[PDB]
């Protein structure tokens, strides 16, 4: 929207406790001035600050070089002064078609004569007639009596150097505080029933997530079992409760008659379901290569859970 305010009384907006969508500000092409001081314009989303101050004013082209740390001049020194250690970016744009008037827009003033330079972020709005000489002005302009402010002849026929530019500097202040203003965060699609490396807010790990049948209180973010292991999380977006199952693992054992009789083997995957790996799912795990039969016999080689294997004709 812009609509920057006057320069002797620049408009300071305090930005806090919010999400700073710097990407909108970065991606558009509406601006001619986007100088940044102390921050990287393309890394702004990753920089969290305690306060962001938006200083809104309109200045002329030749004075844009003055909106910087260390600069001097009629605007930089008597109207809108920036500190030498300013941290933040000045985003300015040509506003000829927004602010300029046919007869000259003189509602915008800058200070030409003032007793001293402004302090960083000082907002001086006095209107006393400036006495340049030793003769009291008593409200009357004249010799050695000059109004401290002067108007801009802003016209649609004016050259660029005399066109208004709207300037808004984002002062980035990091205080001994949580730093509540940050850019937008990345989010991805939820993947169920598969091992993923997950990060839900601050809860990280590897595992399989499934629908939970647990009921969380409105303020509980995750569940933890009797052994301090996270076993459920609330989805930060859709308020679905998901159970976290550690990724299936287990020993791999080879069950075989000796190579003295046959070189054929069967492989048991302990505590692994057969959809995860002659395939026989048993209580001991997934057994691959053995043909399961109904006839019972004396146990030959133990596989566990009452199931035994044997080499038969």
């Amino acid at each position, epitope marked *: 929207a812009t609509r920057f305010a006057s320069v002797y009384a620049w408009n300071r907006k305090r930005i806090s406790n919010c999400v700073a969508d710097y990407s909108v500000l970065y991606n558009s092409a509406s601006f001619s001035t*986007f100088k940044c001081y102390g921050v990287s314009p393309t890394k702004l989303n990753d920089l969290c600050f305690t306060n962001v101050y938006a200083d809104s004013f309109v200045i002329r082209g030749d004075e844009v070089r003055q909106i910087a740390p260390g600069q001097t001049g009629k605007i930089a020194d008597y109207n809108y002064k920036l500190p030498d250690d300013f941290t933040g970016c000045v985003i300015a744009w*040509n506003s000829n078609n927004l602010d300029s008037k046919v007869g000259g827009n003189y509602n915008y003033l800058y200070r030409l004569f003032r007793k001293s330079n402004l302090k960083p972020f000082e907002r001086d709005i006095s209107t006393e007639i400036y006495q340049a000489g030793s003769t009291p002005c008593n409200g009357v302009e004249g010799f050695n009596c000059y109004f401290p402010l002067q108007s801009y002849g802003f016209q649609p026929t004016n050259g660029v150097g005399y066109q208004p530019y709207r300037v808004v500097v984002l002062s980035f202040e990091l205080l001994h505080a949580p730093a509540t203003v940050c850019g937008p965060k990345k989010s991805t699609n939820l993947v169920k029933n598969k091992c993923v490396n997950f990060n839900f807010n601050g809860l990280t790990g590897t595992g399989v997530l499934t629908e939970s049948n647990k009921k969380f209180l409105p303020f509980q973010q995750f569940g933890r079992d009797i052994a301090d292991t996270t076993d459920a999380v609330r989805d930060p977006q859709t308020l679905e409760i998901l159970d976290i199952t550690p990724c299936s693992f287990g020993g791999v054992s080879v069950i075989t008659p000796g190579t003295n009789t046959s070189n054929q083997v069967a492989v048991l995957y302990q505590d692994v379901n057969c959809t995860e790996v002659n395939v026989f799912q048993t209580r001991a795990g997934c057994l691959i290569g053995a043909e399961h039969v109904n006839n019972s016999y004396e146990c030959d080689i133990p596989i566990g859970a009452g199931i035994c294997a044997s080499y038969q004709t």
Partner: antibody
Amino acid sequence: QVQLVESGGGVVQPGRSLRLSCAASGFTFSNYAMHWVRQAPGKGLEWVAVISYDGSNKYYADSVKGRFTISRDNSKNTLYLQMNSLRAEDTAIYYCASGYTGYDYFVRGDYYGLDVWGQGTTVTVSS
Amino acid sequence: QPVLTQSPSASASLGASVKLTCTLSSGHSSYAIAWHQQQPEKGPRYLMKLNTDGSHSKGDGIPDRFSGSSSGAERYLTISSLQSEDEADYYCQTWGTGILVFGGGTKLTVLG
């Protein structure tokens, strides 16, 4: 009023090395980008290197890639240029420079501005 | 990496005006540039940045006789009512990916 005062080069044998320095005063040095530019005797300006204010995102002119190294000490407001395996074509005046950072839409990244120049230092490479 | 093409020399009489032209390559056209001044026996000095729309940003303390304008792949430095001190080398520079590139320069000579 900003000022950049380069520390010295001089004469060295080809294949040796030199550390140029650039002392910055009058602005918040640790927030601005910082350049090296050189001018061979009677040649034009040639851009050499640039460094980010923080995160050291260094870039180099290919005529010095592998040999030169840009760095900065923000605690001392000083910019450095380490030259190695110096060559007689490295004979020039070496200026440092500062600037701001802008998101140019034409390259979809951060350009480094060059808005303030130093006074210079002379580097002579000869057998 | 873009390349800047400057005429190697130019001259005009004292009090006249010149239009120094720095045509960047058609590839990477509409890239922004900056103008720098190098007077004899002196270091460089930053003049202004020029955008594709004709909009400049001057440094502080550089006179009004210097104006910039823009057209196609071309960029112009204009100096009105020339003075003895304006005799100098004028380097346009632009940006690429991280790197910056200068042009050959223009030696402007005052014949007054």
